[PDB]
């Protein structure tokens, strides 16, 4: 016996991965059989469950989330010049899936990102485009949406999203509101 492979802690729900102790914890954070937590930003909701329980949870506990149908929308964040840590959240539905669109203002910079209510593998089929439009000015960010399984905190932390500041916001804002064009496509 030269060494031992240990089963993923999520084997009980179907995971078949068995690995050395040194690369076990790494897998378990990434593992698809890990429970899903609440995709809403912040910690005021500590819910957890199955992927197909996520939308029901949002529909019961977070009824105030604005939702639009379509692959092309305008996400109009109102009151952008508010001081401090502020969030704007909405749902976009298209291609039979639901996407969470998030704009975060940190106490100052703005971070805008899109996440899929779905698995990491599902997220790979999609591209999103965020674009800010002004008079003969356009800033565009394009990327693969994150799965809510992974979340957006790490991405935001490494600026792996649309990142702009309050000065840039002024070039694109109208009446203290910023219209962000969001397009989702299958690639």
């Amino acid at each position: 016996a030269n060494s031992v492979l240990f089963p993923c802690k999520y084997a009980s729900s179907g995971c078949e991965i068995t690995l050395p102790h040194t690369e076990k914890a790494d897998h378990e954070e990434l593992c698809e059989f890990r429970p899903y937590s609440c995709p809403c930003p912040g910690a005021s909701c500590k819910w957890q469950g199955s992927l197909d329980a996520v939308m029901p949870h949002l529909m019961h506990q977070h009824k105030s989330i604005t939702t639009l149908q379509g692959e092309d929308i305008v996400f109009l964040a109102t009151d952008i010049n508010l001081p401090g840590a502020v969030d704007w959240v909405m749902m976009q539905s298209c291609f039979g899936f639901h996407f969470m669109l998030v704009l975060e203002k940190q106490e100052q910079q703005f971070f805008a990102i899109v996440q899929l209510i779905g698995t990491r593998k599902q997220a790979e089929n999609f591209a999103y485009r965020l674009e800010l439009n002004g008079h003969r000015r356009r800033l565009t960010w394009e990327a693969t949406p994150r799965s809510i399984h992974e979340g957006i905190a790490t991405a935001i932390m490494n600026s792996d999203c649309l990142v702009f500041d309050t000065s840039i916001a002024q070039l694109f804002a109208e009446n203290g509101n910023l219209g962000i064009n969001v397009t989702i496509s299958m690639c």
Binding site: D72, I73, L76, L82, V86
Partner: peptide, 13 residues
């Protein structure tokens, strides 16, 4: 592109 517009109100943490 046909774009519905959603007015989203801010949330403070």
């Amino acid at each position: 592109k046909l774009r519905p517009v959603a007015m989203v109100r801010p949330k403070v943490r």
